[PDB]
Amino acid sequence: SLSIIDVASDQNLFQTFIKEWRCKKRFSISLACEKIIRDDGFPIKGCDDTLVVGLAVCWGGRDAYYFSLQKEQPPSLDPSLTLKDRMWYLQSCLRKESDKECSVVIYDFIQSYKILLLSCGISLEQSYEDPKVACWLLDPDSQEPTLHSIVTSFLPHELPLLEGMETSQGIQSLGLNAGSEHSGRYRASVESILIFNSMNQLNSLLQKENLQDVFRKVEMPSQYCLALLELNGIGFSTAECESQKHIMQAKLDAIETQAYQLAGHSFSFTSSDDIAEVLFLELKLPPFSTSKDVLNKLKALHPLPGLILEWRRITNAITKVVFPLQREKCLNPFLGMERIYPVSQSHTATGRITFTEPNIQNVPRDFEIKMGGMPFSISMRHAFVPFPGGSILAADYSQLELRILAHLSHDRRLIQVLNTGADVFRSIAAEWKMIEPESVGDDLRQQAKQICYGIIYGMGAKSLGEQMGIKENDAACYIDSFKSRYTGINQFMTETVKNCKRDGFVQTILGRRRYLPGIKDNNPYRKAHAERQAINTIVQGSAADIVKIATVNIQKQLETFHSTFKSHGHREGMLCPIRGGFFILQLHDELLYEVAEEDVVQVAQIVKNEMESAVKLSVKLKVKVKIGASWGELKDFDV
DNA sequence: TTCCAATGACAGCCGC
DNA sequence: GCGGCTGTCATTG
Numbered sequence A: 001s002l003s004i005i006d007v008a009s010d011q012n013l014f015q016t017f018i019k020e021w022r023c024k025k026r027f028s029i030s031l032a033c034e035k036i037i038r039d040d041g042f043p044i045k046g047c048d049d050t051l052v053v054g055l056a057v058c059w060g061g062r063d064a065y066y067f068s069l070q071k072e073q074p075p076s077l078d079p080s081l082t083l084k085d086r087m088w089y090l091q092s093c094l095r096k097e098s099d100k101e102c103s104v105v106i107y108d109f110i111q112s113y114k115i116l117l118l119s120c121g122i123s124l125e126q127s128y129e130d131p132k133v134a135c136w137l138l139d140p141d142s143q144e145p146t147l148h149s150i151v152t153s154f155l156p157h158e159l160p161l162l163e164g165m166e167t168s169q170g171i172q173s174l175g176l177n178a179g180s181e182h183s184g185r186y187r188a189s190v191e192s193i194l195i196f197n198s199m200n201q202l203n204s205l206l207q208k209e210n211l212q213d214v215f216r217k218v219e220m221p222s223q224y225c226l227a228l229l230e231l232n233g234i235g236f237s238t239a240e241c242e243s244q245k246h247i248m249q250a251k252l253d254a255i256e257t258q259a260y261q262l263a264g265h266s267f268s269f270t271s272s273d274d275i276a277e278v279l280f281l282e283l284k285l286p287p288f289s290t291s292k293d294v295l296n297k298l299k300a301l302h303p304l305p306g307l308i309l310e311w312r313r314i315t316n317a318i319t320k321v322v323f324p325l326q327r328e329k330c331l332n333p334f335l336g337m338e339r340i341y342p343v344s345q346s347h348t349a350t351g352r353i354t355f356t357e358p359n360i361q362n363v364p365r366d367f368e369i370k371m372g373g374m375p376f377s378i379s380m381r382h383a384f385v386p387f388p389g390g391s392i393l394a395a396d397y398s399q400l401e402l403r404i405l406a407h408l409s410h411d412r413r414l415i416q417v418l419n420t421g422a423d424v425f426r427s428i429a430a431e432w433k434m435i436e437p438e439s440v441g442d443d444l445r446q447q448a449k450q451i452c453y454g455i456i457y458g459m460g461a462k463s464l465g466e467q468m469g470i471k472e473n474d475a476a477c478y479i480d481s482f483k484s485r486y487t488g489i490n491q492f493m494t495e496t497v498k499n500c501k502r503d504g505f506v507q508t509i510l511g512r513r514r515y516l517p518g519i520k521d522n523n524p525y526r527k528a529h530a531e532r533q534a535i536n537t538i539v540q541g542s543a544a545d546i547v548k549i550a551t552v553n554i555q556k557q558l559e560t561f562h563s564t565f566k567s568h569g570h571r572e573g574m575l576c577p578i579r580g581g582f583f584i585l586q587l588h589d590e591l592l593y594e595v596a597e598e599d600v601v602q603v604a605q606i607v608k609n610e611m612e613s614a615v616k617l618s619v620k621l622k623v624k625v626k627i628g629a630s631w632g633e634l635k636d637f638d639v
Numbered sequence B: 001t002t003c004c005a006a007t008g009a010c011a012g013c014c015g016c
Numbered sequence C: 001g002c003g004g005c006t007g008t009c010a011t012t013g
C-alpha cells in the first residue's frame, strides 16, 4: 500500500529514520518543488516562481519517507527539528564515508544535482544511478524516456500510481514539475517509489546485457562531468557579437538590394517557392528544388544563386546564433561577466553528447564577408571568452574516427598514412583542384573532409559527383580506387554488415549495442541505410566512448590537484582568486576547459596525457592542445 | 528516399 | 481560426 511517512513530524520518528537511512547502501531520492530567505522552502536559481519544499526517500516496497525542508507550515513540523538541524542530517546522509559503497537513484540526476547544490547548498557525494540513462543504454534509438514511459516498460503493474498525473508524460522530473495541481510531497513520494523499483528492473536488464560496468564506470560519471559543465556555463561577450552583427546586417542589406534589382521585384529569401519562381520560371536557369547543391551549381551561370546562399549563411549567424546567445546570456555576479548555461543531451543514436537552449556546438566556424572588395572576418566563436585572467584550453583528437577504423580493420595502408602522411584532407583537395597542399582555404579543406568521411561511410557516385563537381562515372572510379587501395577497410565493412544481419545489432569498443532491424529489410534503401549506420555506429560510437572516458579521467585528476572548487556553481552554492580548470564545452572529438592563468601548463599536461591514455589501440591517439583569450582566437600550444 | 550524427528556425498544411 | 506535424533550410562535428 502507498504510505508517506512524514519523518520531521516527530523527533523520535526522525532519529529512527536517520539511523536507518545512514546504514542503507541503496535508495532513491526525489526533490519536491512547488509554485509559491523564506520560511516555506528554498528558491531555485532561474525560477522566481518555484521552491524546493522537501524531498522523498525510498529504499524498498511502496514506503516513501518525506523529508520536509520548510521552516514553518501531512502532520506539522516538530519544532525541536530546526531547518539547520534537518540540513545537517540531510548533508550527512547524502555524503560518502570512507570504504562505503552507496548508490542513490535519481530520475534526471543532472537537474537534481544542480538544484541540491544551488538551492540547498548540498553536494551529493555517492555513486549515482539515473533510470533515464539506463533506458538509453538498453536502446539508444528509443524515444527520450519520461517517468510514464519508464513505468510503462519496466514497472507496468504500478501505472495506476501515475493516474491523473499527466506531467509524468513530460521529460521533467515529477517532483521538479511544479506546473501540477498535486503537492510536491505527493509527487516526490510517488516518484521516489516508482524510480527505486524501476531501477531494480533496469539494473537486472543491464546485467543481462552486460552493460552494468559501462553504466557505473563511464555513463553515470560522464553525467557528473556534464553537471559540472552545466553549473560552469561558458563566458560570453555582447560587445564582440554586436559589432559582428552590424557588419553582417550591412552585407544583408546590400545583398537584398542587388538580389531585388536582378530579380526585377521584391521576393522572400525564406520562400523556396518565390526563389524557384525567380530562378527557373522568370530567368530560365537549368534545373523544382532550391537546395544548397542546386544553387552551388547555378552560381557559375548568374550572380543571384550566390547572393541567395550568402543571404542564408549570414541570416543563419544573426537569427540562429547571435539572437539566441544574446537572449540566453545571464549575469554571473561572482565572476563579474555574462555567461550562457546550455543543457547537455546524452540521449543520441551513437553516444555523442549534444546541447540545447542554445546548441553552442552549431556556432559557425570563422567566415569572410566582402564589401566594396574589403574582407571582414566574422568570428562568432570570438564572443566566447574565459573569466578575467583565465584562458580557453581546447584539446582535440587527431582523426580519432580514422584511428579507430585503422585499429578495427588492421588496414596497413591507413596505418602508414596516419604514421607519417601529411593532412589527408589537404592531399585530397590538392589532387582534386590540380594544386600542391599549401593553397587550400578553410572552406575547401572542409569540402575535402566531407568527401573523405562521405566515401568511407558509404556515399554513392551520384552524391560524390555533385560534391566534387564531376560526372557520376568519374565519382564511381574514385570510389573503386579508395576500395582498391584500402582493402582492410572494405573487408571490415562486409564483415560488419554480415555480423549485423545475423545479430540484429552492432557493438562499440565498450560493448554498447545499437539495434538496426532495417538490416534485414527487403527495400533496397532501408537495407543500405542500415548497413551504413552499422559501419558508422561502430566507429563514431567508439570515438564517443573514448572521449567520455577521457572526460571522466581528466575530472578525477583535476579534483586531486584541487585545492579549490570543482565548479563555478560550488562557489554560488557555497554562500580568493579562481584556480584550476572548468569543463565548459564538448565538441565530439574536442574538450574545452576555462583555466586560471597559473594553472594552464599543468591542466594542458593532464588533459593531453589523459586523452592519449584513454584506451590502448593498434595506433597512438594523437592530441593537439590550443589556448587563447577566446574560442575564436585559439593558438597551438606545445605540451 | 542512397555518408552518419546532432539542434533548430520557418513556411505551410490539416484534423480539431 | 489553432496546435501538431512535416518537410526544408541552415549550421556544427
Ligand SMILES: Cc1cccc(N(C)C(=O)[C@@H]2[C@H](O)CCN2c2nc(C)cc(C(F)(F)F)c2C#N)c1
Pocket (backbone or CB within 6 Å): A402, A414, A417, A424, A427, A428, A429, A431, A432, A451, A452, A455, A456, A478, A479, A481, A482, A485, A486
Ligand atoms: C582526389 C580524391 C578524391 C576522392 C578520393 C580519392 N582517393 C581515392 C584517395 O585515395 C585520396 C587521395 O588520393 C589521397 C588521400 N585519399 C584518401 N581518400 C579517401 C576517400 C580515404 C582516405 C583514407 F581513408 F585513407 F584516409 C584517403 C587517404 N589517405 C582522391
Ligand SMILES: Nc1nc2c(ncn2[C@H]2CC[C@@H](COP(=O)(O)OP(=O)(O)OP(=O)(O)O)O2)c(=O)[nH]1
Pocket (backbone or CB within 6 Å): A396, A397, A398, A399, A400, A401, A449, A450, A453, A454, A457, A588, A589, B003, B004, C013
Ligand atoms: N560521416 C561524417 N562524419 C563527420 C563529418 N565531419 C566530421 N565527422 C566526424 C568524423 C570526424 C569527427 C571530428 O570532426 P573534425 O571536423 O574535427 O574532423 P577531423 O577529421 O578531426 O579534422 P580536423 O583535423 O580539422 O580536426 O566528426 C562528415 O561530414 N561526415
Ligand SMILES: [Mg+2]
Pocket (backbone or CB within 6 Å): A396, A397, A398, A399, A589
Ligand atoms: Mg578533429
